[PDB]
Amino acid sequence: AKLETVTLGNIGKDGKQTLVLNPRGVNPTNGVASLSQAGAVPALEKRVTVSVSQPSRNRKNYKVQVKIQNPTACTANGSCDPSVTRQAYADVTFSFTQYSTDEERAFVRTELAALLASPLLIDAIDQLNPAY
Amino acid sequence: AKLETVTLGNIGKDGKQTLVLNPRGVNPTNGVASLSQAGAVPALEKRVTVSVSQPSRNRKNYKVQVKIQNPTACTANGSCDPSVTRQAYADVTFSFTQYSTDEERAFVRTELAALLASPLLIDAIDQLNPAY
Amino acid sequence: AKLETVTLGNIGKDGKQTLVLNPRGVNPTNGVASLSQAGAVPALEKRVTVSVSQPSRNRKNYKVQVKIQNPTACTANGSCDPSVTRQAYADVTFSFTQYSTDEERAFVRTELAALLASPLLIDAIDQLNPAY
Amino acid sequence: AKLETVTLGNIGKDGKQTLVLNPRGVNPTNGVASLSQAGAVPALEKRVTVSVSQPSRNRKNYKVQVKIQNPTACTANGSCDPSVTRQAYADVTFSFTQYSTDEERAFVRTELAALLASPLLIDAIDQLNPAY
Amino acid sequence: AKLETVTLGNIGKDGKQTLVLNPRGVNPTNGVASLSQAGAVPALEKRVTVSVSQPSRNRKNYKVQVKIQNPTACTANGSCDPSVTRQAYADVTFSFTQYSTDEERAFVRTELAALLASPLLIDAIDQLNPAY
Amino acid sequence: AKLETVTLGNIGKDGKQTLVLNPRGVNPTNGVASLSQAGAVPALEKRVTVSVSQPSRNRKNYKVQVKIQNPTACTANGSCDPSVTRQAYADVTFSFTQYSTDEERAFVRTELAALLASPLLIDAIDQLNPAY
């Protein structure tokens, strides 16, 4: 949704950390807005991208795609321009019919939050553990 | 990580609960967990599909994926059987390297909940709003 | 203007009804602001959009444009979902010059509203009966 | 819509201008109705015209157009004869199906008048920002 | 960055103040802010515009572009209408890598302000004195 | 214009650094003034240059172009002579009317120094923040 500064709080393993995302403008060729960690160096700024578009004159379906891109740096090592290794992503899409109501959309999204917050997935992602 | 009955909810758009997903029917030929309301009516119900993958020589990385299915059923005139008409879906893929920490994964996980709860996404689908 | 949940009132045949148009972002490929009916049915939503460029791009004007779509819909008996059977449209274009006065522009805007109120257009539109 | 002298009020930024335009008949070669200003010089007059199209061969709907024109002129450079200088005008069209609802024909007309009063359009033509 | 009304003192030979440029939106197709003192008759108005570009195929750098638009108009010197006859402007481009720190981006920013305030540019720009 | 030793105090993101630039002169191939950072060659490379173009016989349009570059030196372990990364730079041009006054030009020169000095550019440049 609208670009502005976005604060993500109550995050990390303890659920106590915060991250502030500065907005970045929209690339009209794909309709993608971007936000990133409000740090000094882009090479290591965690990124969030939006996306979010109306049903097309082909197959309809309201669709979104939301990405998380999280880089890390090491010693450098020996470089004055530190190398970057991506450690992790998320790529979340949604698809809704043109007749979909607010509650269908809200439940798919808040179910995802409720589900990721379930120990089944908390542990599966923190561990990279299949559920059994 | 561990299969358990999932009684998710509290925050639909109206502050209502959505349940219950029974983690039963795990697919043994791809190792994919199956969470569902489908136990009552498999043709017309809500499901969550959960998979985790370990690295091999053809990828050398880790994957976590959750698929959310929320079909809506209706009985058309002349039918004695409701069928799915309107539908809503979501699909999230996460990916990690072998040097990825649990702390970074927790950030990707918790940042996503923060994003799902944040106006950045509770507008993007609910108000059908692109980033303006 | 800034997209807002715009409420119109004193509208329709008796001049007594209302309509709420919610922000749906702007189209990023042409910078056109868009609102649509608040009710959650994208398939059949009423739409209003606004374009306000200046002469640089086309070395001309640029005329201000407002687009209106009213996709009148009806549910066939026995259908689970309504569809558009008739549509009404409007395209309102106003002149602009980089050297024009804001008062001149207001004169035309308000003149149009006064004309829409005038019986000459009430018949040109309600009957589809052009002036004679 | 019989042409009659129109005496409009509520015109301009503060709604304090009025405008009176007298019938000049209808041009039967294109079906265009016209109301004139009492000024002597055609190039210097304010005027309104009306035209409605119809379904026909290669035409699917009725198109209702009103032309609003308000030239601005002055005795530039000391001229004994004033001239335009500025063209403040609007091309406003509506279109309807032959099976359309009269209530809806009224709504698009009245919705536009309501939209014209609303910040959404008053700034769009009198003084608006790109979009936003 | 986030738009605000900008109140700039110390402008011109005597340090005349205050020049006030209000946030009068952002062009959605290219991220361009438009600041202005009034905007009623744009040709005759003073403006500053700003955008930030991201790297893409073609260029690996991040860019910040600021443009200053200050046309000078003549009053209605018998013409009965003011117009632009002379103009000054600036087109200011900054470019940075993914490894640039904020500290460094700021040197280019503050060095330029410090240089603009220095005799080398006071003479190069105000008297158009040649290099020597 | 005329070259002198230039000291730029109160620079960088905290406004605390002082830079001393030693003029070298004007390169006769293109008439471009140059100021070098007053140390080792890799530091000297962090040059500021000025091109003052008098209105051309075939264009008129005076132009003053200021180029700022700041390559960052880095020596690898086992190396001596550092390589540099052109992490940050700018290219700024002032123009154009041959009939403009020193005040019109000073207005633009100082307007930019005042903008570079303002929160919008402090953030637009130091953290690459968009017009949000």
Numbering used by the authors:
A (entry chain M), B (entry chain C), C (entry chain D), D (entry chain N), E (entry chain E), F (entry chain O): 1 to 132
Sentences from the paper on this structure:
The coat proteins (CPs) of single-stranded RNA bacteriophages (ssRNA phages) directly assemble around the genomic RNA (gRNA) to form a near-icosahedral capsid with a single maturation protein (Mat) that binds the gRNA and interacts with the retractile pilus during infection of the host. The canonical ssRNA phage Qβ has a genomic RNA (gRNA) of 4217 nucleotides, from the 5′ to the 3′ end, encoding the maturation protein (Mat); the major coat protein (CP); the minor capsid protein A1, which is a read-through extension caused by a leaky stop codon for the major CP; and the β-subunit of the RNA-dependent RNA replicase (Rep). Like many other viruses, the CPs of ssRNA phages can also assemble into virus-like particles (VLPs), which are not infectious. Through a native infection without engineering the amino acid sequences, we found that Qβ CP can form diverse VLP capsids, including the T = 3 icosahedral, T = 4 icosahedral, prolate, oblate, and a small prolate form elongated along the 3-fold axis.
Surprisingly, we have also observed that about 1.7% of the VLPs show a “walnut-like” prolate shape. A 3D reconstruction of these particles reveals that they are a prolate form with T = 3 and Q = 4, where T and Q describe the triangulation number of the two caps and the elongated faces, respectively. The elongated faces of the small prolate consist of two triangulation numbers, Q1 = 2 and Q2 = 3. Figure 3A shows the five forms of the VLPs from the wild-type Qβ, each containing 240, 210, 180, 150, and 132 CP copies for the T = 4, prolate, T = 3, oblate, and small prolate forms, respectively. Though all of the 5 forms contain 12 copies of the pentamers, they consist of 30, 25, 20, 15, and 12 copies of the hexamers for the T = 4, prolate, T = 3, oblate, and small prolate forms, respectively. For the prolate VLP, there are three types of hexamers. The “normal arched” type, which comes from the prolate, oblate, small prolate, and regular T = 3 capsids, has a θ angle of ~155°. Interestingly, the hexamer located on the equator of the prolate capsid has an arch angle of ~180°, which is defined as a “straight” type. The same procedure can be repeated to generate a prolate capsid from a T = 3 capsid. One can even repeatedly add hexamers in a multiplication of five in the middle of the prolate to obtain the rod-like VLP particles previously engineered.
